[PDB]
């Protein structure tokens, strides 16, 4: 299926002409991002072996999401660039949809941590058996929405045989699918920032009350500092017509800024008890 990818990469502008052989390479940034993947797989593997003893499953689910995100982007670099024209479009949907299920479950799990710290606070509703029925239905819905949204192009919703709907970052994806992903990502983002402000507004109750919780809800909002410049660029992609906005060609720098969020999540969420500080005493 090489000529199908050739026509879409000629429509987008990443392949210049029907005679030129492709040569998308740097050999600097494509070894840099591997060491970024080599740190995300190394950080998140250490989180999973360190836990053995409710507690820690939400941190363990998130570090599992960031593990597979580090595995899939390391897979994605080795199958992109000059190698991406040896791939079938059915293989191409697997390479790109593997990053929408891992990063989709990573962002959905951050919402599940947001509902967990909100639930056990001021009001114990008897609507939910909160023992293990809540922790299983959250993580089940975090991975069900991620696979459903992430594998939604390969089941049909793509720009195959409809070139004006082709995105410039993802040359086979649908711009209407991206606008579905923009509108529900912001719906995840405005949900987290109103719950995290509600948790800060509901710890004001009856040494002192130093409240470190204002200082941590700002530092966990590096999530908007890591993820929103990609979704500006997705909003640029759906809005800009083809070959008119050339900031979309440096989009791989906006991808890693969403994937360095997977490196920060072992730092932001494992500051309790300081496990690593004892775990390498000798």
């Amino acid at each position: 299926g090489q000529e199908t990818l050739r026509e879409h990469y000629q429509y987008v502008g990443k392949l210049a002409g029907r005679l030129k052989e492709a040569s998308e390479g740097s050999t600097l940034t494509t070894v840099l991002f591997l060491v970024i993947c080599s740190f995300i797989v190394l950080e998140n593997l250490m989180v999973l072996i360190a836990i053995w003893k409710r507690m820690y499953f939400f941190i363990g689910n998130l570090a599992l999401c960031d593990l597979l995100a580090g595995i899939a982007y390391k897979v994605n670099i080795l199958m992109s660039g000059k190698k991406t024209f040896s791939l079938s479009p059915t293989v191409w949907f697997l390479r790109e949809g593997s990053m929408f299920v891992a990063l989709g479950a990573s962002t959905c799990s951050l919402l599940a941590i947001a509902i967990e710290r909100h639930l056990t606070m001021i009001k114990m509703r008897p609507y939910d058996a909160n023992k293990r029925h809540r922790v299983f239905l959250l993580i089940g819905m975090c991975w069900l929405i991620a696979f459903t949204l992430g594998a939604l192009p390969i089941l049909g919703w793509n720009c195959l045989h409809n070139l004006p709907d082709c995105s410039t970052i993802l040359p086979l994806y649908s711009k209407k699918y991206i606008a579905f992903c923009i509108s529900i990502f912001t719906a995840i983002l405005v949900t987290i920032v109103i719950l995290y402000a509600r948790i800060y507004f509901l710890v004001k109750s009856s040494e002192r009350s130093m409240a470190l919780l204002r200082t941590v809800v700002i530092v966990v909002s590096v999530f908007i500092a890591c993820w929103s410049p990609l979704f500006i660029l997705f909003l640029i992609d759906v809005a800009c017509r083809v070959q008119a906005c050339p900031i979309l060609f440096k989009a791989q720098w906006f991808i890693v800024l969403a994937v360095l969020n997977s490196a920060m999540n072992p730092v932001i969420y494992t500051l309790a008890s300081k496990e690593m500080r004892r775990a390498f005493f000798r």
Partner: antibody
Amino acid sequence: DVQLQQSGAELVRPGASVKLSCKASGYTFTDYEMHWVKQTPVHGLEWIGAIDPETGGTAYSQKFKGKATKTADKSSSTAYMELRSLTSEDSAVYYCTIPYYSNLRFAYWGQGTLVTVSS
Amino acid sequence: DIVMTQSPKSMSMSVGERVTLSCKASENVGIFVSWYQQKPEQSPKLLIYGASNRYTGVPDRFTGSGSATDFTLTLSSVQAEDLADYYCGQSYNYPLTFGAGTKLELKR
């Protein structure tokens, strides 16, 4: 930014040869193809051929396989097209243009070299 | 190759009228058809690439349309600097083939 300076004004005897040039500036020359288009008042716009500047690989039309010959010198960022044994049919304006980003958008054209074939 | 048949050959216009130029293809070309404008002793200057994607500096009176075989280019108000020659070209397969021409002229 992107100009295609083109060596214009030629005048050639019949049976002689001519070598035209299209000089590129404002972009990396080895990343996009160079195309050459011929315009007569009778036959209209005619495609002569194209060339990939890095790795000197060409593709022609079958009408011009034998007239036109294309080279590319990446050290000077210019492209050459050589017409050979010209008749009166070969007197036209020859444009150079690029597929800028892709063959979808031929946005940047040259200026034309007028070739008059008299004797 | 791929023959593109462009009509009309010439049409005499007065300022402010609407015109629509047709360009049909012998084959499926997709949406790779462009539209160019040429003035005397000047390069062809690209107006519309793609289905209907206006190049930078092309006004709102230029409108493209088409898919696979039938392609149109319309002018909602012909202005005085739009009086030039116009072409369509296919760009879907090398060799590139263009139309024959459409000369917009002044009506008296």
